[PDB]
Amino acid sequence: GPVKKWECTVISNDNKATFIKELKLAIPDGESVPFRAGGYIQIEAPAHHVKYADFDVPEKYRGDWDKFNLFRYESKVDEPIIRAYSMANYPEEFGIIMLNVRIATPPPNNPNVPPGQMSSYIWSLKAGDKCTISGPFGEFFAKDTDAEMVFIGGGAGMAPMRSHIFDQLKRLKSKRKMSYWYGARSKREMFYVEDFDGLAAENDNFVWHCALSDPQPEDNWTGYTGFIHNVLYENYLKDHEAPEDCEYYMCGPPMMNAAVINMLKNLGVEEENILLDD
Ligand SMILES: Cc1cc2nc3c(=O)[nH]c(=O)nc-3n(C[C@H](O)[C@H](O)[C@H](O)COP(=O)(O)OP(=O)(O)OC[C@H]3O[C@@H](n4cnc5c(N)ncnc54)[C@H](O)[C@@H]3O)c2cc1C
Ligand SMILES: NC(=O)C1=CN([C@@H]2O[C@H](COP(=O)(O)OP(=O)(O)OC[C@H]3O[C@@H](n4cnc5c(N)ncnc54)[C@H](O)[C@@H]3O)[C@@H](O)[C@H]2O)C=CC1
Ligand code: NA
């Protein structure tokens, strides 16, 4: 009754990184989900059986798949399932839902356990497939203030970061000072580069930076390296006159969230200015 549902068509489902796919969904009749940036939807899947060997993984991203023999895996799901995924589009990107979905493979120290149910299903989807979503939901919303904003994302945590940043600069026409600090493992794992480069070129109040935590020899990389929290500290927060006056929004793997939070507390940032999704 109260929660709305849409039967969507898959527009595309391309790899954006070795272990991340961008699922793009078309909403029926060109309508839009009435969400807020930072929110999420629930995807549901029927019973199914999929093989990793059938995933479309481009050769550019296949290196670690071959290296760890990840095409061995199969996922057998006996009953319908449901999971949450965050919108990577912002609300005025009408008619679509964009998601960034990390494949949850078996842990390497435990390789024979079942692969992740829903991410394996999503990775099997191809253009033209149908996909049912409900919502929207969420609580990871921007504060309505004039404070400087610092966004920290890592890996698939890109999704709500993109939603938030575009919402501020395009829908809200914000003049707030904004920066985005994004951690990727190596150059091929970067994505949405055109999106944020364009925003920074058009908005004097927005800048962004990528740090590579494991740069590869073929990257010819001369930018920032290491964990993103160390890069943000060294190149911006260390010398900030008043880091406690900023609002920090972050989404990354658990160990990135913990390192960022620790660093901000050590700088005297208060918990009300440190925001994560639940
Ligand atoms: C609000 C919210 C927003 C989210 N947004 C996103 C998003 O934007 N993008 C995203 O990628 N995810 C997101 N997530 C996480 C997402 O919902 C899923 O939890 C994730 O995709 C994994 O689900 P799964 O069904 O693929 O894996 P599951 O089936 O839940 O399995 C999880 C992992 O456990 C492993 N495992 C299984 N059995 C065992 C065992 N016996 N021992 C050890 N390990 C085992 C699996 O191989 C897999 O690695 C979000 C979650 C929430 C709550
Ligand atoms: N809860 C939510 O709203 C959302 C959750 N996610 C989750 O985000 C996760 C992202 O994971 P991946 O893409 O595999 O990330 P990853 O392995 O590619 O790492 C991304 C970056 O995180 C940082 N990082 C990683 N390990 C670190 C450590 N030990 N210490 C400090 N920094 C570290 C590095 O800068 C690294 O480049 C996924 O598991 C996904 O489920 C994704 C989107 C939204
Ligand atoms: Na700029």
Numbering used by the authors: 128 to 405
Task: Kindly provide excerpts from the paper associated with this entry.
In the human pathogen Vibrio cholerae, the sodium-pumping NADH:quinone oxidoreductase (Na+-NQR) generates a sodium gradient by a so far unknown mechanism. Na+-NQR is composed of three integral membrane subunits, NqrB, NqrD, and NqrE, and three hydrophilic subunits, NqrA, NqrC, and NqrF. The six subunits NqrA, B, C, D, E, and F of Na+-NQR harbor a unique set of cofactors that shuttle the electrons from NADH twice across the membrane to quinone. Here we show that ion pumping in Na+-NQR is driven by large conformational changes coupling electron transfer to ion translocation.
Subunit NqrF consists of two domains, an amino-terminal [2Fe-2S] ferredoxin-like and a carboxy-terminal FAD-binding domain, which is similar to ferredoxin-NADPH reductases (FNRs). The C-terminal FNR-like domain catalyzes NADH oxidation, and the electrons are transferred via the ferredoxin-like domain to the integral membrane subunits NqrD and NqrE. The mode of NADH binding was further characterized by X-ray structures of the isolated FNR-like domain of NqrF, as well as of a variant of NqrF lacking the C-terminal F406, which is important for binding of NADH.
